[model samples]
Target: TVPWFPRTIQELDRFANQILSYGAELDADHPGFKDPVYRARRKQFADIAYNYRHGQPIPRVEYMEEEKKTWGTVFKTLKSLYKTHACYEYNHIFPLLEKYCGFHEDNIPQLEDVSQFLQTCTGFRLRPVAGLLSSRDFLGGLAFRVFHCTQYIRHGSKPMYTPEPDICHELLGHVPLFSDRSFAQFSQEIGLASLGTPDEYIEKLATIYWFTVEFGLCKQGDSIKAYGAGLLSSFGELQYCLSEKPKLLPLELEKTAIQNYTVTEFQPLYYVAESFNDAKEKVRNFAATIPRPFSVRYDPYTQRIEVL
Candidate 1:
């Protein structure tokens, strides 16, 4: 069997694709499980990612009217909550996304335009993925500042819910913060640390990623705000996380790395970062503790990783 770690961006892309299976098999309880049209549409989207190459233009999806409607519902709902619940970095870059990426209730942005906009902002780019990748492969892409996004929309029947990440979640939840340079670098740092780490460390790194990138909170002048994509994308969790219900603790790299979390229900606990810069420093220190033999660095011009 091939090794789990990827050396270059091309190897990373191939590894991500190799591990991904065609059209995700929806669970019995999934909203789209019984809809033939939705199943067929998902298969089409999967094929697009399967055929995607590194340098080729990201293929465009002529979104169905129903898909657009689903995007609209999620967009409007999250847009309303962002001012009150999302982090400062997210709020600052969101309007810019609307101005440049056609982020609105009525339209779904293409990956090419969004990737181009991110390149100008933080040198990060988007790649399409059929479904979720293994933790190692997903994190490996991030070392090159690559985010693998899904093109499919959630089922129209459940406009506000999806068991998996959809275009709405990726665009509205994650894209804004990636535009901020500090946050972008912080994300890549986590990805870089995951390379060639042991299985035990990979679990710890994935846990750290879950609490920070997926469901993180940050301080804002005496108030806590949501910065993680999982919180930003869900209307229910967005409000619940900020309410008095969950246990909020100051983020510590050690504690957070070992923390356990659940994905099916609302998170009962969350970690709050002082700031992105502070979090970045903490991550850097933590990365040094990983027992890799050599260090690595990314060259954005050539989009490859060089081992030191």
Candidate 2:
């Protein structure tokens, strides 16, 4: 059964369905389980999730050489992309990420460190998940200003890219924007609105999230710039999203919530937000009408959600 909650959950089964152990029975073609070396990496992923107690969201893990290499390659690549492709706000706030969060070309920063940095800026923190999560669970965490991230890097063989999200994708792409207050507020509203909404409505909100958070673009005065993590982290699509090929439509909450998306290839359509504040107000305005019967809040001392 699916678990529903108003506030973020700290502990959930990360690899609840995997049989045997990662090295023993995991599929070879899976993103993080591609090779024998990755099996040990997978084990680390499971251990952190299994041992993670509520309130202690951080896990201390030692990154290996291969993982560091993956981070370095992707880090160096995307750093260059951000110079020309990333939005002004993203580029503006990026230095804070580097100064406070240890984002660099040669190192894979720990989630706890990054989490702390965000807490200071936007009340958001990072939690480690074993692998992929359902859209509902992942997005739900954001309601409480918590983000579930992967600690493992993508396969070294494909250092430049991965079909699934990896640590590099999470850190380099998503974390930077968390520093911006307006974007942070926009993200949390989506999460808050999602609670108690019908499955269909939640799906619509997820589509809105997909267009804005995952693959969104923003207008920066004279030019369009990359703001969505998917575009920021992707070498191909970052350039493609701004090109003349795909259509860039003005952002509308109801229209974007129903937009179709496919991860198998570059998105055929994209939404353009004038600014984060514009997106934030639009989401909150739409959220005000969502027909949930209850309200909730996060208790820092108890580290649990309280229904109001």
Candidate 3:
């Protein structure tokens, strides 16, 4: 069990009471959590979910100067390739891997071609604000995949627990996972599920999102593997998640939904998925099982509201 779950906050306390109350109600009769406590707690932890994002400090950049220089060469090269064709260059901080990280070394293409390349690879998406977005563009990127991001990032004075969504957290962190097939499919489904999600329980969706997409774990026989974007991106969480200090539980739907823990420090526990497809299957089914926002079916292609 996470040491600081259902944090002592008033909201958390309220949820604790709700648990007692819900439990009391169940205690009076046949008792068993329908989907586990985390699912139920999701509604109670709406505020936490609303604030669930990477907190920013004095903008302590982790970028290695050498890494920056390496990317600079790639940026210049991408620029030259863009000149070969007529297309719009992206105006964002994230550098392309091929352009910077040496993911590839091949013939250059136009900015149009490069833009396409960027989308398919580790690229950029400008978060105008950069925080856990109450709402989003709610559509896929160049392809039919949703681009999940918050509008604001933390700045001066808004550290510790600011509501801002950090750009690095979004681009540097979450985007790379989009490339891996299992992760990619999982992310896309989350986007698809998120769109038109009922305002009442967006936090529930957020909790599931955080558990799997953001901070999920996976099995590697005797141990768990790091897979969640939130865990992977954070130097602290990444190290702590696998440390001997915290607990690593096999991924379980009932437990994950009911599970609650604090993010202020390195995590003391994690939920490990069996496989990527396992995640995908659970997520797809979750979209079906969770309380949908409306009677309308979402049309991702047109971003149109579809009626059931």
Candidate 4:
């Protein structure tokens, strides 16, 4: 959770660092991101951050042909599955993603364009990241309706799967939900609940976020449809989650908050929400139980999180 101390919005310089640098693990051999490709991408990411204007939306990258090919490969493979397995809300606004946001199999959509489309539909905007962020940094961005997204595509060898969240995951899996008002609000609520919350409560919030945002499922009529980004982008897990192998549980704060999860394999369990509204109300109720003494608001104009 971000420091809850009250803050005052001043001028441009103070808030410029609010958009954290995307790359640099502080070491040559970072455990999570070991590939040389990540290091090369970090150089580009640094340039984007060093020169970026605050609140200008995400900076665009000139993707290489291989990167576009990776995108195309992932897009063609997952596009078919999404039509059938994606939740009603995801399918509903997916067309807007192509029309308004420029999602296509042949081309990689720029984050700036997507941010513009999303900001118009909801309050959310996208920010570029070199690689994964610290839990605090990632969740903290959401408090202000900004998403810390990656520009790199997964290595070309594994078109269908990647251990890390690549551009395919952000663009295809998460972006569609941003187009839906209720889902967008639901995501922002998680961000708001995370700010200034205690560590224990923050862990619980992350658990809820994991189950709902990363691997959530919801009903579309009698069938369970995927709404989580992890499932939406990965054809392997998307099929596995909906298959009879994994245990499916109804979404509940008390239970999901304590539920153990594994990262190496398909999740053993998944939490199901009745709808975006149901998830929204449940999370709000959970947030009510937290003992944060001060309230906070994100000022988009100034780009500083003001502790109220």
TM-score, one value per model:
0.96, 0.88, 0.52, 0.86
**In TM-score terms, which candidate is top?**
1
Query: What lDDT tens digits, residue by residue, belong to model 4 across residues 179-296?
Result: 7888987887787777778888888888898999899999778889999998899888988888889989899999899888987788989999999988989988898888887666
lDDT of each: 0.87, 0.78, 0.43, 0.77
Question: What's the lDDT for candidate 1?
Answer: 0.87
Ranking by lDDT: 1, 2, 4, 3
lDDT of 3 at 189: 63
The per-residue C-alpha lDDT of model 4 at residue 106 equals 80
Residue 217 lDDT (model 3)? 69
Relative to the unseen true structure, what is the C-alpha lDDT of residue 243 in candidate 3, on a scale of 0 to 100?
67
Worst lDDT 10-window in candidate 4: 5-14
Q: lDDT (0-100) at residue 91 of candidate 2? A: 90
**Which lDDT tens digits does candidate 1 get at residues 68-100?**
999998998878999889999998998889999
Residues 133-232 of candidate 3 have per-residue lDDT tens digits of 2322222221134343432222222222222234334443455455455555666565555544554334555566667767876665565656675654
Query: Residue 205 lDDT in model 3?
Result: 55
Worst 10 residues of 1 by lDDT: 16-25
Per-candidate count of clashing residue pairs (backbone under 3 Å): 0, 0, 17, 0
**Deviation from truth (RMSD, Å), model 2:** 3.4
Candidate 3: residue 86 lDDT (0-100): 10
In model 2, the worst 10-residue window by lDDT is: 16-25
Model 4 deviation from the true structure expressed as Cα RMSD, one decimal place: 3.7
